[PDB]
Amino acid sequence: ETLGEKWKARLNQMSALEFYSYKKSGITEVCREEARRALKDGVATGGHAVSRGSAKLRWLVERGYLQPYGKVIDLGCGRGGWSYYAATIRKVQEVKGYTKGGPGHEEPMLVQSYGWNIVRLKSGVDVFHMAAEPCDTLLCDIGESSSSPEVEEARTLRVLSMVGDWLEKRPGAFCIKVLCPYTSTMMETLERLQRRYGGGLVRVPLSRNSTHEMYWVSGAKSNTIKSVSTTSQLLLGRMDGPRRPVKYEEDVNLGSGTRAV
Ligand SMILES: C[S@@+](CC[C@H](N)C(=O)[O-])C[C@H]1O[C@@H](n2cnc3c(N)ncnc32)[C@H](O)[C@@H]1O
Numbered sequence: 503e504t505l506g507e508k509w510k511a512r513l514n515q516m517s518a519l520e521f522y523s524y525k526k527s528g529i530t531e532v533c534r535e536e537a538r539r540a541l542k543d544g545v546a547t548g549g550h551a552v553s554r555g556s557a558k559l560r561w562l563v564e565r566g567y568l569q570p571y572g573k574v575i576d577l578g579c580g581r582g583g584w585s586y587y588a589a590t591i592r593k594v595q596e597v598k599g600y601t602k603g604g605p606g607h608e609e610p611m612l613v614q615s616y617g618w619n620i621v622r623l624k625s626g627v628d629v630f631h632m633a634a635e636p637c638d639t640l641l642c643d644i645g646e647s648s649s650s651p652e653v654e655e656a657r658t659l660r661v662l663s664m665v666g667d668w669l670e671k672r673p674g675a676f677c678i679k680v681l682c683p684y685t686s687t688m689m690e691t692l693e694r695l696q697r698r699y700g701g702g703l704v705r706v707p708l709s710r711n712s713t714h715e716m717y718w719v720s721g722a723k724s725n726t727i728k729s730v731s732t733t734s735q736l737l738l739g740r741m742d743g744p745r746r747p748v749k750y751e752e753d754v755n756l757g758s759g760t761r762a763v
Pocket residue numbers: 552553554555556577578579580581582583584585600601602603607608627628629630643644645
């Protein structure tokens with residue numbers, strides 16, 4: 503019934519070959535070849551981003567959608583891509599990342615990118631069972647893809663409910679992954695959340711066409727229906743016609759060394 507639901511149904515009908523070309527058609531991608539090998543060879547001082555997450559956060563920050571500062575909380579930090587990137591930001595003073603880790607999940611990576619000394623990454627943490635703490639900047643990049651739109655909605659609702667307790671502590675800046683923004687009940691939930699805490703939804707072009715993920719960010723302000731519908735229509739339009747080339751880009755160089763605080 504919604505355009506996003508139409509997109510999801512069409513996505514599930516695609517052959518594996520059509521899906522493969524479709525998911526990268528006209529997207530933005532960072533070149534990670536050089537970063538992956540240095541990280542594999544244990545290079546910690548090359549300015550290499552631990553994951554392609556640093557570039558997704560950089561995209562949002564560089565466009566003014568988020569202005570990180572003070573104490574940053576990174577929920578579902580994984581290897582630490584958002585945490586290490588936030589530590590390079592002048593107004594940022596402390597970064598605390600939390601992640602599940604363990605078998606089948608990303609573990610925090612220890613690197614020496616610029617500002618690494620203000621980053622604490624904690625593994626073995628279930629953020630859904632941890633008490634919210636005050637912070638200035640709240641980041642959350644949780645939301646596992648599913649072929650079922652009901653499973654995506656249930657997972658998004660779980661993330662947004664947990665994030666609610668942290669937003670109650672009133673951070674001035676936030677960036678929250680919204681895995682499933684495209685069902686009718688999700689658009690109503692997001693409009694209510696936007697009226698209460700502000701911000702708006704943004705589509706990052708580094709996201710694959712195989713996900714409808716959007717980011718709820720403190721610096722945006724847009725009609726929920728409009729913003730989600732615009733994304734749904736872009737994703738639907740890429741399902742037909744030629745395969746468009748990927749816009750390749752240099753990955754973020756996060757420099758090296760400590761910061762004085
Ligand atoms: C998409 S990744 C984050 C990528 C990260 N922003 C980066 O730039 O490297 C989401 C992470 O959240 C973790 N995660 C998922 N559910 C979690 C939970 N209940 N508690 C803590 N971490 C969780 C996953 O293990 C995964 O490492």
